[PDB]
């Protein structure tokens with residue numbers, strides 16, 4: 237790939253190959269609570285996922301993805317700022333080199349250890365992820381900040397699956413899992429129009445950032461960093477980090493559901 241998180245192909249250099257990197261709707265961003273607008277037209281977030289839609293876990297070199305079958309509405313996101321139903325298709329994480337950083341979004345300048353992203357595409361208006369991916373209202377991603385602390389038992393199935401996809405390109409069946417079990421108890425959120433946090437960086441994401449964080453232990457984070465970005469047989473290259481720095485709001489307004 238022509239992009240990554242290293243010095244030469246990293247976030248700071250993405251604009252060379254992907255000009256949109258310097259766009260007006262880029263993510264992640266720093267959420268300044270003193271500037272958020274408490275909107276009353278925002279309904280509660282509603283998620284209903286079918287564990288049978290879980291399909292496969294894949295090492296994609298810079299991270300790993302857990303994909304879901306998206307041929308129907310068995311797993312969907314509704315409510316919040318949406319009028320359309322969004323179909324679940326994947327969830328993944330972002331982490332940093334050390335516990336000091338790792339999340340992509342930040343709140344009042346505070347950086348967390350990792351971040352969970354649960355992605356969905358607008359099946360009410362579009363026919364596929366491919367079509368929806370580049371549409372302004374095509375994607376909806378829930379972001380959950382992960383604060384280093386007690387080990388999180390709900391991450392167990394995901395963590396135990398990593399040993400089967402250690403190197404780039406490896407993939408394995410990952411079934412019977414409901415990602416709503418990874419979300420915090422409260423679904424109060426912030427929302428703003430943004431983009432994918434890595435190439436192609438399409439500004440097609442309506443973000444849903446949870447106010448409440450979830451926990452993750454230092455050892456669990458070590459497991460993410462123990463994944464390898466190289467292909468089997470080559471010198472091991474640990475996946476140390478994959479979080480993009482926060483970008484300028486460019487006048488966008490972050491709304492709060494609380």
Ligand SMILES: NS(=O)(=O)c1ccc(CCC(=O)O)cc1
Pocket residue numbers: 353355377431432433434441
């Ligand atoms: N980081 S993020 O903005 O939550 C995000 C969500 C979905 C994809 C689609 C990724 C793919 O299919 O390779 C990429 C990035």
Ligand SMILES: [Zn+2]
Pocket residue numbers: 328329330353433
């Ligand atoms: Zn992400």
